[PDB]
């Protein structure tokens, strides 16, 4: 692994574990046993570290939420989209925790995150659109589906934060809450299985 | 106004405007034109300021969410509960922004916030329970209602945070998203008005 990749890997670990608030470039250099100057060669400041870490998260989520258009959406796809996004949110937990300071610190990050959020929302719309086509949920108007998609986002991205105030694999039980959003829209064909599936995620 | 009350009022203003992360007791003393020693008399450290500010927010929300039991719940009550909680979340915006560091800094705050969250959730259950009794929504099982109540909480407390990433009275349009949760459970009697009401909050 190249020195640079260690820097990104270790920074992520320290940010997730101690909070980005409390981690400086000197801490990161000390952890990695490289001089401050060595770290500076690869990254001029902490914001540049954070931006590149975000760019890896962005690439990951885009890859998971690249919806296939040549086949119908299955329940196994639904569980994959949900689990993989929840795993992402755990692996990059430092980001959503200090989100608002990170956006304010970096206009590039703010711009990219706004655009990323629209892609994610557009993938949630698209998943529901396909679930309708497959006969899993009842098809809904353009407005009520945009609203419902935002609620999915709001629930998923605030689950970690709720767990810290209520008290790894403890984390995925937020799927139960997301599936609760689509409980009354389930068609007769699938009501039995989707509820059965939902139950397997209960805290 | 007593010197102490100014300290709490001004600390809230500086925390909301600049972020608690970036505000120290010296900044607060400087803003108020009182010596560091004068501030120390009233508050030994920043955590004590924050705890007391939280205790005022807690009292406020408890007062708004003290559900009357001697009459049925109306739609006007529903809008009040929603608007007042959203106004609270704006007025104390600094708290939810740095929530996780604030809980970690103070075990008293962590304990009280966990308990406060249960009271709030228990008021959401109770509001739905009363909406069922009034014939506004369809009555739901104990489990599906606990789940739905948590989704309300998850949506409300993450609305501010979404607005910073998507781009005062701009803030209350999250009511549309909360009411979207109860759209399919509306009874024939009230479907017309609750949707009509929901529309008045559209961004």
Short mmCIF file of C-alpha atoms in Angstrom, two decimals:
data_model
loop_
_atom_site.label_atom_id
_atom_site.label_comp_id
_atom_site.label_asym_id
_atom_site.label_seq_id
_atom_site.Cartn_x
_atom_site.Cartn_y
_atom_site.Cartn_z
CA UNK A 1 0.00 0.00 0.00
CA UNK A 2 1.40 3.47 -0.98
CA UNK A 3 2.11 6.02 1.82
CA UNK A 4 -0.77 8.19 0.50
CA UNK A 5 -3.32 5.35 0.72
CA UNK A 6 -2.25 4.67 4.34
CA UNK A 7 -2.80 8.36 5.09
CA UNK A 8 -6.41 8.17 3.75
CA UNK A 9 -7.06 4.80 5.50
CA UNK A 10 -5.64 5.94 8.86
CA UNK A 11 -7.31 9.37 8.74
CA UNK A 12 -10.68 7.64 8.22
CA UNK A 13 -9.98 5.36 11.28
CA UNK A 14 -8.98 8.29 13.54
CA UNK A 15 -11.92 10.46 12.34
CA UNK A 16 -14.46 7.60 12.92
CA UNK A 17 -13.00 6.64 16.30
CA UNK A 18 -12.08 10.06 17.86
CA UNK A 19 -14.17 12.54 15.76
CA UNK A 20 -12.74 14.73 12.99
CA UNK A 21 -13.16 17.71 15.39
CA UNK A 22 -10.37 16.23 17.56
CA UNK A 23 -7.96 14.99 14.88
CA UNK A 24 -5.25 17.21 13.34
CA UNK A 25 -2.71 16.52 10.63
CA UNK A 26 -0.01 16.20 13.37
CA UNK A 27 -2.00 13.38 15.01
CA UNK A 28 -2.30 11.61 11.66
CA UNK A 29 1.48 11.96 10.98
CA UNK A 30 2.24 10.70 14.53
CA UNK A 31 -0.10 7.63 14.14
CA UNK A 32 1.55 6.74 10.82
CA UNK A 33 5.15 7.43 12.08
CA UNK A 34 5.79 9.82 9.11
CA UNK A 35 7.02 13.39 9.56
CA UNK A 36 4.59 16.37 9.28
CA UNK A 37 6.50 17.27 6.09
CA UNK A 38 5.90 13.78 4.65
CA UNK A 39 2.14 14.19 5.20
CA UNK A 40 2.24 17.72 3.74
CA UNK A 41 3.73 16.33 0.44
CA UNK A 42 0.61 14.21 -0.07
CA UNK A 43 -1.94 16.64 1.55
CA UNK A 44 -1.65 20.44 2.08
CA UNK A 45 -4.29 20.36 4.90
CA UNK A 46 -6.99 18.29 6.69
CA UNK A 47 -9.77 19.47 4.27
CA UNK A 48 -7.94 17.86 1.35
CA UNK A 49 -7.81 14.57 3.26
CA UNK A 50 -11.53 14.78 4.01
CA UNK A 51 -12.48 15.67 0.41
CA UNK A 52 -10.63 12.66 -1.01
CA UNK A 53 -12.14 10.34 1.61
CA UNK A 54 -15.58 11.67 0.59
CA UNK A 55 -14.75 11.08 -3.08
CA UNK A 56 -14.11 7.38 -2.24
CA UNK A 57 -17.49 7.16 -0.36
CA UNK A 58 -19.24 8.91 -3.27
CA UNK A 59 -17.73 6.39 -5.76
CA UNK A 60 -18.77 3.49 -3.53
CA UNK A 61 -22.40 4.55 -3.07
CA UNK A 62 -22.75 5.43 -6.81
CA UNK A 63 -21.46 1.92 -7.63
CA UNK A 64 -23.97 0.30 -5.22
CA UNK A 65 -26.85 2.56 -6.47
CA UNK A 66 -26.18 2.05 -10.20
CA UNK A 67 -29.58 0.50 -10.85
CA UNK A 68 -29.72 -2.14 -13.60
CA UNK A 69 -32.26 -1.14 -16.30
CA UNK A 70 -32.22 -4.42 -18.34
CA UNK A 71 -34.13 -6.56 -15.70
CA UNK A 72 -36.89 -6.13 -13.07
CA UNK A 73 -35.98 -5.21 -9.46
CA UNK A 74 -36.20 -8.14 -6.99
CA UNK A 75 -36.53 -8.23 -3.15
CA UNK A 76 -32.89 -9.46 -2.93
CA UNK A 77 -31.85 -6.25 -4.80
CA UNK A 78 -33.89 -4.19 -2.34
CA UNK A 79 -32.11 -5.76 0.68
CA UNK A 80 -28.73 -5.28 -1.02
CA UNK A 81 -29.37 -1.55 -1.72
CA UNK A 82 -30.45 -1.07 1.92
CA UNK A 83 -27.72 -3.14 3.62
CA UNK A 84 -24.89 -1.73 1.48
CA UNK A 85 -25.90 1.89 2.10
CA UNK A 86 -26.17 1.16 5.89
CA UNK A 87 -22.69 -0.47 5.80
CA UNK A 88 -21.42 2.66 4.01
CA UNK A 89 -22.90 4.97 6.63
CA UNK A 90 -21.10 2.92 9.34
CA UNK A 91 -17.76 2.80 7.50
CA UNK A 92 -17.77 6.58 6.93
CA UNK A 93 -19.62 7.46 10.18
CA UNK A 94 -17.32 10.49 10.82
CA UNK A 95 -18.80 12.32 7.82
CA UNK A 96 -22.49 12.59 8.82
CA UNK A 97 -21.50 13.34 12.42
CA UNK A 98 -19.68 16.60 11.58
CA UNK A 99 -21.53 17.15 8.31
CA UNK A 100 -22.40 20.80 8.71
CA UNK A 101 -18.89 21.94 9.68
CA UNK A 102 -17.39 19.91 6.81
CA UNK A 103 -19.72 21.56 4.22
CA UNK A 104 -18.93 25.02 5.68
CA UNK A 105 -15.16 24.29 5.63
CA UNK A 106 -15.13 23.29 1.96
CA UNK A 107 -17.14 24.70 -0.97
CA UNK A 108 -16.01 21.79 -3.18
CA UNK A 109 -17.38 19.31 -0.67
CA UNK A 110 -20.60 21.30 -0.26
CA UNK A 111 -21.10 21.43 -4.05
CA UNK A 112 -20.33 17.70 -4.60
CA UNK A 113 -22.45 16.58 -1.57
CA UNK A 114 -25.53 18.55 -2.80
CA UNK A 115 -25.15 16.82 -6.21
CA UNK A 116 -24.51 13.41 -4.65
CA UNK A 117 -27.66 13.80 -2.50
CA UNK A 118 -29.70 14.43 -5.72
CA UNK A 119 -28.21 11.27 -7.35
CA UNK A 120 -29.05 9.23 -4.24
CA UNK A 121 -32.61 10.67 -4.14
CA UNK A 122 -32.94 10.00 -7.89
CA UNK A 123 -31.89 6.35 -7.22
CA UNK A 124 -34.54 6.06 -4.43
CA UNK A 125 -37.20 7.38 -6.88
CA UNK A 126 -35.97 4.95 -9.45
CA UNK A 127 -36.05 1.96 -7.02
CA UNK A 128 -39.66 2.71 -6.12
CA UNK A 129 -40.47 3.24 -9.82
CA UNK A 130 -39.07 -0.27 -10.49
CA UNK A 131 -40.81 -1.81 -7.41
CA UNK A 132 -44.09 -0.48 -8.91
CA UNK A 133 -43.21 -2.06 -12.33
CA UNK A 134 -42.38 -5.40 -10.65
CA UNK A 135 -45.76 -5.39 -8.77
CA UNK A 136 -44.16 -5.18 -5.29
CA UNK A 137 -45.63 -1.79 -4.27
CA UNK A 138 -48.63 0.14 -5.60
CA UNK A 139 -47.65 2.78 -8.22
CA UNK A 140 -47.79 6.32 -6.79
CA UNK A 141 -48.12 9.91 -8.23
CA UNK A 142 -44.88 11.80 -9.06
CA UNK A 143 -45.29 14.14 -6.01
CA UNK A 144 -46.16 11.55 -3.32
CA UNK A 145 -43.19 9.40 -4.54
CA UNK A 146 -40.69 12.36 -4.36
CA UNK A 147 -41.96 13.03 -0.83
CA UNK A 148 -41.68 9.35 0.15
CA UNK A 149 -38.16 9.16 -1.31
CA UNK A 150 -37.01 12.09 0.78
CA UNK A 151 -38.45 10.35 3.92
CA UNK A 152 -36.32 7.26 3.13
CA UNK A 153 -33.25 9.50 2.92
CA UNK A 154 -34.19 11.34 6.12
CA UNK A 155 -34.64 8.04 8.02
CA UNK A 156 -31.53 6.30 6.71
CA UNK A 157 -29.07 9.15 7.22
CA UNK A 158 -30.33 9.91 10.75
CA UNK A 159 -30.31 6.29 12.09
CA UNK A 160 -26.69 6.24 13.42
CA UNK A 161 -27.42 9.58 15.23
CA UNK A 162 -30.57 8.10 16.87
CA UNK A 163 -28.65 5.03 18.12
CA UNK A 164 -26.09 7.19 20.02
CA UNK A 165 -29.05 8.85 21.97
CA UNK A 166 -31.18 5.66 22.57
CA UNK A 167 -28.43 3.06 23.33
CA UNK A 168 -21.66 -2.45 13.81
CA UNK A 169 -24.44 -5.22 13.28
CA UNK A 170 -26.50 -3.40 15.97
CA UNK A 171 -26.76 -0.68 13.11
CA UNK A 172 -28.67 -2.47 10.32
CA UNK A 173 -31.98 -2.67 12.33
CA UNK A 174 -32.86 0.77 10.70
CA UNK A 175 -34.00 -1.27 7.67
CA UNK A 176 -37.12 -2.14 9.75
CA UNK A 177 -37.83 1.63 9.96
CA UNK A 178 -37.32 2.19 6.19
CA UNK A 179 -39.57 -0.77 5.30
CA UNK A 180 -42.20 0.63 7.70
CA UNK A 181 -42.51 3.56 5.23
CA UNK A 182 -43.72 1.20 2.46
CA UNK A 183 -45.90 -1.18 4.63
CA UNK A 184 -49.34 0.28 3.61
CA UNK A 185 -48.37 0.50 -0.14
CA UNK A 186 -47.54 -3.25 -0.45
CA UNK A 187 -49.62 -5.08 -3.12
CA UNK A 188 -51.59 -8.27 -2.32
CA UNK A 189 -48.94 -10.43 -4.19
CA UNK A 190 -46.01 -9.35 -1.95
CA UNK A 191 -47.52 -8.16 1.43
CA UNK A 192 -46.73 -11.64 2.99
CA UNK A 193 -42.99 -11.73 2.08
CA UNK A 194 -42.04 -8.02 2.46
CA UNK A 195 -43.53 -8.03 6.03
CA UNK A 196 -41.77 -11.41 6.65
CA UNK A 197 -38.50 -9.87 5.45
CA UNK A 198 -39.11 -6.70 7.53
CA UNK A 199 -39.49 -8.83 10.70
CA UNK A 200 -36.02 -10.40 10.20
CA UNK A 201 -34.57 -6.85 10.93
CA UNK A 202 -36.44 -6.08 14.28
CA UNK A 203 -34.74 -4.36 17.36
CA UNK B 1 -32.38 40.66 33.11
CA UNK B 2 -29.83 39.13 35.57
CA UNK B 3 -26.17 38.71 34.42
CA UNK B 4 -26.64 34.90 34.48
CA UNK B 5 -29.68 35.01 32.16
CA UNK B 6 -27.72 37.17 29.68
CA UNK B 7 -24.93 34.58 29.77
CA UNK B 8 -27.42 31.79 28.82
CA UNK B 9 -29.14 33.98 26.17
CA UNK B 10 -25.87 35.15 24.58
CA UNK B 11 -24.25 31.70 24.68
CA UNK B 12 -27.26 30.29 22.80
CA UNK B 13 -26.90 33.10 20.14
CA UNK B 14 -23.15 32.49 19.67
CA UNK B 15 -23.58 28.67 19.60
CA UNK B 16 -26.43 28.89 16.99
CA UNK B 17 -24.61 31.46 14.84
CA UNK B 18 -20.92 30.29 15.02
CA UNK B 19 -21.24 26.63 16.21
CA UNK B 20 -20.56 25.48 19.77
CA UNK B 21 -17.33 23.88 18.43
CA UNK B 22 -15.95 27.40 17.83
CA UNK B 23 -17.21 29.21 20.94
CA UNK B 24 -15.26 29.27 24.24
CA UNK B 25 -16.09 30.80 27.59
CA UNK B 26 -13.61 33.65 26.80
CA UNK B 27 -15.61 34.52 23.66
CA UNK B 28 -18.83 34.57 25.69
CA UNK B 29 -17.26 36.83 28.38
CA UNK B 30 -15.88 39.14 25.64
CA UNK B 31 -19.31 39.38 23.85
CA UNK B 32 -21.02 40.25 27.15
CA UNK B 33 -18.23 42.68 28.29
CA UNK B 34 -17.87 40.79 31.64
CA UNK B 35 -14.54 39.45 32.91
CA UNK B 36 -13.67 35.72 32.60
CA UNK B 37 -13.91 35.62 36.41
CA UNK B 38 -17.44 37.09 36.30
CA UNK B 39 -18.53 34.30 33.93
CA UNK B 40 -16.77 31.69 36.09
CA UNK B 41 -18.90 32.77 39.15
CA UNK B 42 -22.07 31.80 37.29
CA UNK B 43 -20.60 28.84 35.26
CA UNK B 44 -17.49 26.70 36.01
CA UNK B 45 -17.19 25.63 32.31
CA UNK B 46 -18.90 25.55 28.86
CA UNK B 47 -20.61 22.16 29.59
CA UNK B 48 -22.53 23.73 32.48
CA UNK B 49 -23.76 26.48 30.15
CA UNK B 50 -24.87 23.91 27.59
CA UNK B 51 -26.63 21.69 30.17
CA UNK B 52 -28.71 24.58 31.50
CA UNK B 53 -29.60 25.73 27.98
CA UNK B 54 -30.76 22.15 27.27
CA UNK B 55 -32.81 22.14 30.48
CA UNK B 56 -34.68 25.24 29.17
CA UNK B 57 -35.32 23.49 25.78
CA UNK B 58 -36.45 20.32 27.61
CA UNK B 59 -38.92 22.37 29.74
CA UNK B 60 -40.23 24.12 26.63
CA UNK B 61 -40.85 20.98 24.57
CA UNK B 62 -42.42 19.16 27.58
CA UNK B 63 -44.78 22.14 28.00
CA UNK B 64 -45.74 22.06 24.29
CA UNK B 65 -46.10 18.21 24.31
CA UNK B 66 -48.20 18.03 27.51
CA UNK B 67 -51.17 16.45 25.76
CA UNK B 68 -54.61 17.34 27.17
CA UNK B 69 -56.50 14.17 28.19
CA UNK B 70 -59.92 15.79 28.96
CA UNK B 71 -60.86 16.53 25.25
CA UNK B 72 -60.36 15.01 21.77
CA UNK B 73 -57.33 16.01 19.64
CA UNK B 74 -58.16 18.43 16.78
CA UNK B 75 -56.28 19.28 13.52
CA UNK B 76 -55.41 22.72 15.00
CA UNK B 77 -53.68 20.86 17.91
CA UNK B 78 -51.79 18.73 15.39
CA UNK B 79 -50.47 21.82 13.54
CA UNK B 80 -49.54 23.45 16.87
CA UNK B 81 -47.56 20.38 18.07
CA UNK B 82 -45.72 20.27 14.71
CA UNK B 83 -45.04 24.01 14.29
CA UNK B 84 -43.94 24.52 17.91
CA UNK B 85 -41.49 21.61 17.84
CA UNK B 86 -40.06 22.91 14.49
CA UNK B 87 -39.71 26.42 16.01
CA UNK B 88 -37.90 24.80 18.96
CA UNK B 89 -35.49 22.94 16.70
CA UNK B 90 -34.66 26.28 14.97
CA UNK B 91 -34.26 28.24 18.22
CA UNK B 92 -31.89 25.61 19.67
CA UNK B 93 -30.32 24.59 16.32
CA UNK B 94 -26.80 24.42 17.87
CA UNK B 95 -27.80 21.37 19.94
CA UNK B 96 -28.71 18.84 17.21
CA UNK B 97 -25.77 20.02 15.09
CA UNK B 98 -23.11 18.96 17.62
CA UNK B 99 -25.32 16.41 19.36
CA UNK B 100 -22.91 13.52 19.54
CA UNK B 101 -20.00 15.53 20.98
CA UNK B 102 -22.34 17.15 23.54
CA UNK B 103 -23.61 13.74 24.77
CA UNK B 104 -20.02 12.42 24.96
CA UNK B 105 -18.87 15.56 26.86
CA UNK B 106 -21.56 15.25 29.53
CA UNK B 107 -23.06 12.13 31.14
CA UNK B 108 -25.83 14.24 32.74
CA UNK B 109 -26.83 15.55 29.33
CA UNK B 110 -26.63 12.08 27.78
CA UNK B 111 -28.83 10.63 30.55
CA UNK B 112 -31.43 13.46 30.42
CA UNK B 113 -31.52 13.50 26.55
CA UNK B 114 -32.17 9.70 26.38
CA UNK B 115 -35.09 10.19 28.84
CA UNK B 116 -36.37 13.28 27.04
CA UNK B 117 -36.34 11.37 23.71
CA UNK B 118 -38.55 8.65 25.33
CA UNK B 119 -41.02 11.33 26.60
CA UNK B 120 -41.14 12.90 23.12
CA UNK B 121 -41.66 9.46 21.49
CA UNK B 122 -44.33 8.67 24.11
CA UNK B 123 -46.08 11.97 23.17
CA UNK B 124 -45.95 11.02 19.44
CA UNK B 125 -47.54 7.62 20.29
CA UNK B 126 -50.11 9.39 22.35
CA UNK B 127 -50.95 11.94 19.58
CA UNK B 128 -51.54 9.12 17.09
CA UNK B 129 -53.55 7.22 19.74
CA UNK B 130 -55.77 10.32 20.10
CA UNK B 131 -55.96 10.91 16.29
CA UNK B 132 -57.30 7.32 16.05
CA UNK B 133 -59.89 8.06 18.83
CA UNK B 134 -60.98 11.28 17.06
CA UNK B 135 -61.46 9.37 13.72
CA UNK B 136 -58.70 11.30 11.88
CA UNK B 137 -56.39 8.32 11.17
CA UNK B 138 -57.09 4.58 11.11
CA UNK B 139 -56.21 2.85 14.43
CA UNK B 140 -52.98 0.83 14.17
CA UNK B 141 -51.37 -2.13 16.09
CA UNK B 142 -49.03 -1.29 19.02
CA UNK B 143 -45.89 -2.30 16.99
CA UNK B 144 -46.65 -0.51 13.70
CA UNK B 145 -47.51 2.68 15.70
CA UNK B 146 -44.20 2.57 17.71
CA UNK B 147 -42.37 2.17 14.39
CA UNK B 148 -44.32 5.04 12.79
CA UNK B 149 -43.67 7.26 15.82
CA UNK B 150 -39.94 6.73 15.56
CA UNK B 151 -40.11 7.68 11.81
CA UNK B 152 -41.79 10.99 12.78
CA UNK B 153 -38.93 11.65 15.21
CA UNK B 154 -36.31 10.64 12.65
CA UNK B 155 -37.81 12.98 10.01
CA UNK B 156 -38.37 15.98 12.29
CA UNK B 157 -34.97 15.99 13.98
CA UNK B 158 -33.07 15.55 10.69
CA UNK B 159 -34.90 18.28 8.67
CA UNK B 160 -32.59 21.23 9.57
CA UNK B 161 -29.56 19.02 8.62
CA UNK B 162 -31.13 18.20 5.21
CA UNK B 163 -31.77 21.89 4.43
CA UNK B 164 -28.05 22.81 4.90
CA UNK B 165 -27.14 20.15 2.19
CA UNK B 166 -30.03 20.87 -0.30
CA UNK B 167 -30.22 24.73 -0.11
CA UNK B 168 -36.29 30.58 9.68
CA UNK B 169 -39.79 30.27 7.85
CA UNK B 170 -37.95 28.34 5.07
CA UNK B 171 -37.69 25.62 7.93
CA UNK B 172 -41.34 24.68 8.63
CA UNK B 173 -41.87 23.01 5.18
CA UNK B 174 -40.71 19.71 6.91
CA UNK B 175 -44.32 19.42 8.16
CA UNK B 176 -45.20 18.32 4.57
CA UNK B 177 -42.74 15.42 5.02
CA UNK B 178 -44.16 14.41 8.45
CA UNK B 179 -47.75 14.51 7.14
CA UNK B 180 -46.63 12.37 4.17
CA UNK B 181 -46.02 9.58 6.75
CA UNK B 182 -49.76 9.52 7.66
CA UNK B 183 -51.24 10.10 4.12
CA UNK B 184 -52.30 6.45 3.45
CA UNK B 185 -53.75 5.99 7.01
CA UNK B 186 -56.20 8.93 6.70
CA UNK B 187 -59.89 7.94 7.21
CA UNK B 188 -62.60 8.84 4.65
CA UNK B 189 -63.96 11.63 7.00
CA UNK B 190 -60.67 13.60 7.10
CA UNK B 191 -58.65 12.65 3.91
CA UNK B 192 -59.92 15.90 2.17
CA UNK B 193 -58.81 18.37 4.92
CA UNK B 194 -55.55 16.73 6.12
CA UNK B 195 -54.28 16.63 2.46
CA UNK B 196 -55.54 20.25 2.03
CA UNK B 197 -53.64 21.24 5.17
CA UNK B 198 -50.53 19.30 4.03
CA UNK B 199 -50.49 21.27 0.74
CA UNK B 200 -50.32 24.61 2.60
CA UNK B 201 -46.76 23.52 3.76
CA UNK B 202 -45.22 22.58 0.29
CA UNK B 203 -41.56 23.49 -0.78
#
